[PDB]
Design a protein around this ligand. Structure first.
Ligand code: MG
Ligand code: MG
Ligand code: MG
Ligand code: MG
Ligand code: MG
Ligand code: MG
Ligand code: MG
Ligand code: MG
Ligand code: MG
Ligand code: MG
Ligand code: MG
Ligand code: MG
Ligand code: MG
Ligand code: MG
Ligand code: MG
Ligand code: MG
Ligand code: MG
Lengths: 181, 76, 138, 214
RNA sequence: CAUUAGUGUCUGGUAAUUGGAAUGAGUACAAUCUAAAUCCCUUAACGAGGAUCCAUUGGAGGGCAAGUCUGGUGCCAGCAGCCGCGGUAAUUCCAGCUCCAAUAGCGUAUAUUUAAGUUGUUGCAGUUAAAAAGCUCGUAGUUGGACCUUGGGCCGGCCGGCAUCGCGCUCCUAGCCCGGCAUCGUUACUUUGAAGAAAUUAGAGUGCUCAAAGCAAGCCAUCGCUCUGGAUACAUUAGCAUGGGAUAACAUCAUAGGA
RNA sequence: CUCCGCCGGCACCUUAUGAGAAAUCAAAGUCUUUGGGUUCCGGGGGGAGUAUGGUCGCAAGGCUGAAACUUAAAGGAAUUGA
């Protein structure tokens, strides 16, 4: 039975200590400020960050002129720059370890829609993205955790078929017009 | 010690015992710092002295006296 | 002291092999007497209720702990199972099928109930939880 | 007010001391807590544990409360104070004053590369109190503090950001655990590293610079 | 203004307050999907006022986050992993309210890993907490003192190439009389290489709308097709080959049977 | 018999710069800064040095040596009281 060969994986991990106030409050700060739906969204960002940090630490352990260090360091730095996760002049691979989960959270399409105007709020931005209302280059994206790249940050705008940047009105805007007539 | 951009990032480089080269920590209250004065000529004293530091380890072994005796025998 | 020779690998490995038997967990899992236990290396087991007995609690407490003696279908052993909730003993009747699980602590008695390491979890194909919380009836 | 009773206290009141490092360099015993409270502007305190101890008597058991207070600016000074008193509030007050009296320097270092601000302990360091031994190992930047709650609070008040910690003994004895952690921090400055190989140029001690004023 | 007020800031909210805007859950013409259907992706028209289109599982003494609130019961019934609670003023039972954690999921049983430096090679212990055999001898086993040049220089920009007081060559490679030749002690060790299935793991590339994935795809005038990709690495032990000869094994110049 | 010195014993006294949970210890030091060599031996308290099999003994017994079950502590050092 082929299709048994399709891979799949886990994206987050629960905390070792269930109830500690300090972590609880620190996590709720982020879940509120960035308008996330639950702790799992924060924990998957942490897990992705821990992956990239283990890679960076391994490459930093080796010695320069090691072609693995060279090749993978250039690739990892390019990946970090491509998503705006790293300022200019920072391509030293020690500034990857300094990178924070707030930086990943800052690149989600929810946060960028809020930060670009268009939203008036962080929760308005989410409900705006999950209602087919926002496009990136030409495509209607409705996943708030899209993680835009720095190149495509310019072309974000409203959809051509949402009332707020497109064409025809919605259910209720038409419904009131018909009952009015 | 030094940041890689030239800066000096330690605060308070400690003193080192002049007999054993051990560090004299902030909380080592058995250490002393001796200033022995320089006699030159008529009057036989101006504000010129040489300084020696002894940590609590040496002072507690008793070897402070021998160490000081041997460190004062340096000629200039 | 410990052997440290380069050519001492046999001595170290055989020594660890001998000494691991001094460890109660290793010996418990590697000696085979778990297949002689009531459940025979199982999480749960089904049984028929033989009678309802009721057991006292140990000294610092004072109460009657209401348990049902069950016979295991798979092997015919006879055990006692606590019926956990207030009034759930009245759901238990005579000669009805019952699903029993462990008590926690992996075969060791829990709390103040003397010599009982099993608990009743289902009766007549219906949960004690649903009967105590009125979600389903039998 | 203050009206200090020590030579250091007098020199601090006249304001001829700006940081604590000129008292650290000369290993001077700091006997009045106000000396700290001027030289360290933003020192933060925290109660970590209140523990009741008892002595048996013919009439009954006499109870006293012992407080553990860690203090420190998160920029390289920490102190730990423990105080036993008949009432929790006065035990806490005495613990604050003792913790301020005990403030010690902690040197920070880099794990692999000397970029930016120092983040870890310089090298592997250990501390012991009673049966508890605490080991602190340098960690890569951004790796957090891998330690239990007690040493984590102590290290946070120290301004160390990344460190790998290991421990042994009865850490559930919080007294010895916290004092072992403090003892581990205080000896980061007692290890002879090649950047300390340079010969020392001695300076006049504060009792000797300010001779004419006293 | 901060005086003496008073309200207005980001709205924080019991507010079944008022107000429209937005949307897909559901329903469904149609097209598409498909071997035929189906689901998805597109989509006409329907489809949201908060009683419903109604979120649960466990908890609230400590560990461990969250009530010294109100009824019931009275060492009973019951809870409780452990410590413990309940004997007429229950923070622990039975319930209500309220609060807490995770959340389309959460609880329980059993097995296993972590915690566990409580199996310890790294890395634990043995006076008194468990634990030095009553004492010595002794074979295997493990362990084993020091000692025999790469030391003094040239050489070109880490190393080659020489020279000091470098056991040889006919035969393979063989400079224009000239480096750098092979058998007349073996191994461990180390260095480099070859040959090592894929899938899995790590990892390069790539916007399946994101992701888990997959091995694709991207440009053309997104016009009679262009550029393509489908890397790379890890792989203990054993076996093959290559340089090194410090460290350590095993064999061994006093019958000179030596060259 | 007196004084001095060097090896080798049985020990003792004073002291941490040491170690340890401490009592204490100049070896129980040179340990998270953990690696000189080697043998025996421990892994919560009981059950239990018990049952069983083997082996040695005239015998008493010696050596070797479990499991089921049970239990939240048993224990070491020191302190204040009684
Ligand atoms: Mg165990
Ligand atoms: Mg609930
Ligand atoms: Mg409850
Ligand atoms: Mg709790
Ligand atoms: Mg709490
Ligand atoms: Mg439970
Ligand atoms: Mg108890
Ligand atoms: Mg509870
Ligand atoms: Mg309740
Ligand atoms: Mg142990
Ligand atoms: Mg005894
Ligand atoms: Mg003993
Ligand atoms: Mg032998
Ligand atoms: Mg003698
Ligand atoms: Mg054990
Ligand atoms: Mg035992
Ligand atoms: Mg005693």
């Amino acid at each position: 039975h082929v299709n048994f060969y399709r891979n799949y994986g886990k994206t987050f991990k629960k905390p070792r200590r269930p109830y500690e106030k300090e972590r609880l409050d620190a996590e709720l700060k982020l879940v509120g400020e960035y308008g996330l739906r639950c702790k799992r969204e924060l924990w998957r960002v942490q897990y992705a960050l821990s992956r990239i940090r283990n890679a960076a630490r391994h490459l930093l352990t080796l010695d320069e002129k090691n072609p693995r260090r060279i090749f993978e360091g250039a690739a990892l730095l390019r990946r970090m720059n491509r998503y705006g996760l790293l300022a200019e002049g920072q391509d030293k691979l020690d500034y990857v370890l300094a990178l924070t989960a707030e930086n990943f959270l800052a690149r989600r399409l929810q946060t960028l829609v809020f930060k670009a105007g268009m939203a008036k709020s962080i929760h308005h931005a989410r409900v705006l993205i999950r209602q087919r209302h926002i496009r990136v280059g030409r495509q209607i994206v409705n996943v708030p955790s899209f993680m835009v790249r720095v190149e495509s940050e310019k072309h974000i705008d409203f959809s051509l078929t949402s009332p707020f940047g497109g064409g025809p009105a919605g259910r209720v805007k038409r419904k009131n017009q018909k009952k009015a007539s | 010690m030094q940041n890689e951009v030239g800066d000096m990032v330690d605060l308070y480089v400690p003193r080192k015992c002049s007999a054993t080269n051990r560090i004299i920590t902030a909380k080592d209250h058995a250490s002393v710092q001796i200033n022995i004065g320089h006699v030159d000529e008529n009057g036989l004293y101006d504000g010129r002295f040489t300084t020696f530091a002894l940590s609590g380890f040496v002072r507690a072994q008793g070897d402070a006296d021998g160490s000081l005796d041997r460190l004062w025998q340096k000629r200039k | 002291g410990k052997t440290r020779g380069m050519g001492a690998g046999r001595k170290l490995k055989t020594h660890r092999r001998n000494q691991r038997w001094a460890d109660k967990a290793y010996k418990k899992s590697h000696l085979g007497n778990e297949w002689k236990k009531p459940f025979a290396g199982s999480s749960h087991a089904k049984g028929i209720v033989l009678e309802k007995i009721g057991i006292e609690a140990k000294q610092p407490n004072s109460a009657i702990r209401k348990c049902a003696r069950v016979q295991l279908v798979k092997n015919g052993k006879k055990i006692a199972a606590f019926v956990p909730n207030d009034g759930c003993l009245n759901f238990i009747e005579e000669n009805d099928e019952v699903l029993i699980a462990g008590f926690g602590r992996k075969g060791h008695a829990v709390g103040d109930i003397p010599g009982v390491r099993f608990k009743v979890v289902k009766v007549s194909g219906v949960s004690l939880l649903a009967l105590f919380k009125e979600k389903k009836e039998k | 007010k203050w009206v200090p009773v020590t030579k250091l206290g007098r020199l601090v009141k006249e304001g001829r001391f700006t940081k604590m490092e000129e008292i650290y360099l000369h290993s001077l015993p700091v006997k009045e807590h106000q000396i700290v409270e001027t030289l360290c502007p933003g020192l933060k305190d925290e109660v970590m544990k209140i523990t009741p101890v008892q002595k048996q008597t013919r009439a009954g058991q006499r109870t006293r409360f012992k407080a553990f207070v860690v203090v420190g600016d998160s920029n390289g000074h920490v102190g730990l104070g423990v105080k036993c008193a008949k009432e929790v509030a006065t035990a806490i007050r005495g613990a604050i004053i003792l913790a301020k009296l005990s403030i010690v320097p902690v040197r920070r270092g880099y794990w692999g590369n000397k970029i930016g601000l120092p983040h870890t302990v310089p090298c592997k360091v250990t501390g012991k109190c009673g049966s508890v031994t605490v080991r602190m190992v340098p960690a890569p930047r951004g790796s957090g503090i891998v330690a239990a709650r007690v040493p984590k609070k102590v290290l946070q008040f120290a301004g160390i950001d990344d460190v790998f910690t290991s421990s042994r003994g009865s850490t559930k004895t919080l007294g010895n655990f916290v004092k072992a952690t403090f003892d581990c921090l205080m000896k980061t400055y007692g290890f002879l590293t090649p950047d300390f190989w340079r010969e020392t140029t001695f300076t006049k001690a504060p009792y000797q610079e300010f001779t004419d004023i006293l």
